[PDB]
Structures are given as structure tokens and as C-alpha cells.
């Protein structure tokens, strides 16, 4: 058996329990990573800085 997902869920739950002002910036980073991984390709062209 494997239980990595349960461990990650427990980590996220314990993070939500220990709520601070800086949880929102981490949630924003996570959702941005998910969004970029989900679509990507479409709106990336030129602009090596981007």
C-alpha cells in the first residue's frame, strides 16, 4: 500500500490549523503552480524574462 496523499493532506490540515497572515501567499503560489501546469504553452511566447 501507499499513503503519500494522506500524508500531504495531513500536512495541509495541520498548516490550516496553524493559521497565520502568510498562509494566503502560499495558497496563491500553490494555485498558480496548478494553473500553470494545467494549461501552460498557450500564453508563453518570446519575452525570455517571462
Amino acid at each position: 500500500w501507499d499513503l503519500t496523499a494522506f500524508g500531504l493532506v495531513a500536512e495541509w490540515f495541520l498548516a490550516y490549523i496553524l493559521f497565520t497572515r502568510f498562509f494566503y501567499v502560499l495558497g496563491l503560489a500553490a494555485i498558480m503552480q496548478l494553473f500553470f501546469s494545467y494549461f501552460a504553452v498557450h500564453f508563453i511566447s518570446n519575452s525570455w524574462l517571462m
Binding site: 518570446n46 519575452s47 525570455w48 524574462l49
Partner: protein, 50 residues
């Protein structure tokens, strides 16, 4: 060239950040060659020359 290295590094970083996306490639390669010749000479002298 007529600046101290302490501000020269910041000037080079700012120029590379800002003017890069709107300049021809050969200008950038000439800039890189002119900046890196002073270290290419030292590297060639100390690790390649005879």
C-alpha cells in the same frame, strides 16, 4: 567604462534586464563579448596558454 565596478555591476544588470527584449541579437552578443573579454584573457592565460 568610466564608472566604478560597484556601480558598474548594477548598471550592467539593469541594462540587461531592461533593454534586452527590444534590441537586436548582435548588439547583445557584442555587449557580452566586450564585457567578458577581460575574463576570457585571464582564463586563456591561466588555464589554456601553452
Amino acid at each position: 567604462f568610466y564608472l566604478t565596478n560597484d556601480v558598474s555591476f548594477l548598471a550592467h544588470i539593469q541594462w540587461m534586464v531592461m533593454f534586452t527584449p527590444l534590441v537586436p541579437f548582435w548588439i547583445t552578443i557584442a555587449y557580452i563579448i566586450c564585457i567578458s573579454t577581460k575574463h576570457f584573457y585571464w582564463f586563456f592565460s591561466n588555464y589554456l596558454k601553452r
